[PDB]
């Protein structure tokens, strides 16, 4: 319990990832304030707001600071997806993904940084993706917004060291309801096709499975912790080896 007296804010807090991050941070002693589009745990407070709405972000951050007196940790985890290549992505959907996934993070960080400066220490963990380094097909706005998020990461880390560390977590496929929905979109519903498809994505990760939301949450907690006190501006992949794998088969002398 090393996060005792520390306050954490976590966005997309009713996500698979978000919920696991909330649970991991409460388990290590923090008070967690959760932010999401729903009313949807062990959070000390929940804010139902749109991270792209500046007045809403500002009010939430100020109510938190007023009530708890401090914010030590921000986890930017809010993010949406459109499965379209670029030229097939309508303008409002493009702008909206870049707005949610990039500007939402900027806005949270913008209002949260002053308090962390005031207080002397802070830790900002940006939940990005393996799509921050490489691209799947049909993910133009998503891949671009996750690349952005590392730039956002490296900038904050450079401008605010040593008081604030800022790092990115880059997950491969993580078991969440989104993953189920995507399988269902791709293959439909003949006998166990949905499950076989989730198992197949697992088989492309060198680990031969997909990740659990708590395995992401453990990495977030470590970055939030004094344990990682010389890591900042880093982009840690949690992807079961995916990004280091070349998918060219090879004989076996």
């Amino acid at each position: 319990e090393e996060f005792t007296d520390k306050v954490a804010i976590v966005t997309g807090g009713s996500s698979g990832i978000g919920l696991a991050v909330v649970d991991a941070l409460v388990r290590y002693g923090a008070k967690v304030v959760s932010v999401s589009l729903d009313e949807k745990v062990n959070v000390s407070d929940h804010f139902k707001i749109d991270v792209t709405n500046e007045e809403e972000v500002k009010e939430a951050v100020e109510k938190t600071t007023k009530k708890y007196g401090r914010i030590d940790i921000l986890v930017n985890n809010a993010g949406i997806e459109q499965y379209s290549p670029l030229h097939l992505t309508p303008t409002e959907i493009w702008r909206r993904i870049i707005d949610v996934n990039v500007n939402g993070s900027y806005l949270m960080a913008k209002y949260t940084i002053p308090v962390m400066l005031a207080i002397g220490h802070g830790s900002i963990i940006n939940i990005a993706s393996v799509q921050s380094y490489a691209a799947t097909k049909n993910a133009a706005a998503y891949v671009t917004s996750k690349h952005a998020l590392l730039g956002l990461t490296r900038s904050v880390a450079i401008d605010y060291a040593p008081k604030i560390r800022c790092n990115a977590v880059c997950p491969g496929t993580i078991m969440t309801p989104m993953v189920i929905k995507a399988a269902k979109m791709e293959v439909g519903e003949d006998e166990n096709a949905v499950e076989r498809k989730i198992e197949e994505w697992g088989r492309q990760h060198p680990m031969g499975r997909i990740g659990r939301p708590e395995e992401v949450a453990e990495v977030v907690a470590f970055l939030a912790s004094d344990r990682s006190s010389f890591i900042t501006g880093a982009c840690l992949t949690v992807d079961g080896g995916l990004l280091s794998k070349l998918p060219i088969s090879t004989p076996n002398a």
Copy 2:
């Protein structure tokens, strides 16, 4: 003669880099359609804001109507504000992302189906060494240049083999943007400006700063069939800056 009968669109075509690119391409025989905020040796100029969907659509349809092809798109429109993230005003943050990322989305959006319909294209995003690492007080800029690499990788992967999409990541290049950055740091004092530039030059292994035409040659190579198995790549044109660790060493 290499680009004879090929049509290239380049945005930010009054730029240090845009202008040099426009010229290499003209020199190598391309018909160049220049795009910028201003009013040059090109075949067509559109004075338009790349963030204006209507103006982009119109410039791309006119070009297509007139030449019946677009072989090459160079996305080079870019703005730079100087602020750390929490001191960046929201409207300024939103505008930089809009210009540097959405303007590229928009040019590509109308250009890609033309290239697919016709057989072949080459798209080049002018990104930056700041697509890999940050300077101080450049939050929106750094974010948007990292974003461009993603747009690049995405386009490459969805549109191979017909469309090749690559990024050129320059270091400090001698351009009006760079001269201006120096005065904002050092005053309009002619003499201090050159001292500032030469200091940036000495941060680069090459010991000088780049010329816009050295960037334009790399854009030319990427637009060319010579780079026909290159796509989704980020080519640094940085005199070695990114491979340099700035910690001194005994020379012994």
Copy 3:
């Protein structure tokens, strides 16, 4: 209490970094087998050369006959000489590649099948920020730390899920190698040295160089079940060094 009953081997075990990894793993309850040329309450010590296959084979087989397991291997034996490439004597170049790269091949070669037979392992290679970017006059060292990333990635990919393999890439850390490096540039002069250290620290966004324990926490995290979906990764522990572009920018 997390590593109770687990067996760790750490090479370069009286290194600054080596020593802190040793204490950290001991303090989280591991049985630690130290490897070095030297002589900390480890459970065993081997005074061997990692480039000597016989000695490596001996240390690894005694260990597994003794404990019936090797859960954790930390490759950290690492030498350095200063010389640019063409001025590096052949024997010294070969020696640095041998220790830094083959020493790791050898330890892993004997440890892997043990981990595979028993069910599980974590291997952590201590590489460097010089696995990504170069300093001057460090040809052999820079090439050898890049090689270790390839060694890491290969091992990760051939042996998942049962073995996780990852690299830690430290920035400037307060160790004996680093104090020596400073003396080699600056002299024995006591606070000339610490001026040089301060100058390095100032190159890192954090404003100071790392402590060996900051490295060992990262190694502990990677040896641990907490990082169970992490493999083939490079974790920089560099106070932001690699994410920083060393080019000044205007204020406000």
Copy 4:
């Protein structure tokens, strides 16, 4: 034209890639010296030497300079492969691959560099691999040596700028007689199995085909040319998009 009166040394000169580099540099005007273990008269001189034998390297560089007065361009392209994971790679095989692939390049560079500093300019091109960034299974010594080559590349670039530029070319699968051998090793010879397998590898690259040796040579020639006068210490992929591709299927929305 551009290389008229220039001299280039290319190692592994009777390989598919080496052969196409030699032809490309001759087309652009160079006098080209080949180095290989073997016995192509595009070349104006050929040295049947082992790049790991310092005295041979020294003698060949020395004979080249006395003949031509100059070496403008060095292409390190000597490489051997073994298809084994680390723990199945015997010690002599491991040391020999690191030796040829890393030590061979060090040696050539070691003797060419003072020639290049004397004449005042040089361009060094290291033929590395997509295996310089990520890994196939069963390729431990090879992946290690190709990562090493990038560090060799960055060091030379850092220490010898502005007079000597040093860059790396990172090919994906290139049609070579080695690719035929690897396919043969992997599937054997039932009907067109071997050709299908080379075709399957092509399908893994976003380009949907493998590369031609000449497409690698074009990039080497650009890197040797003054056209790339501000590129140094860069590692340029020629891989049909392979390294930018995530192999996780997605739906189309």
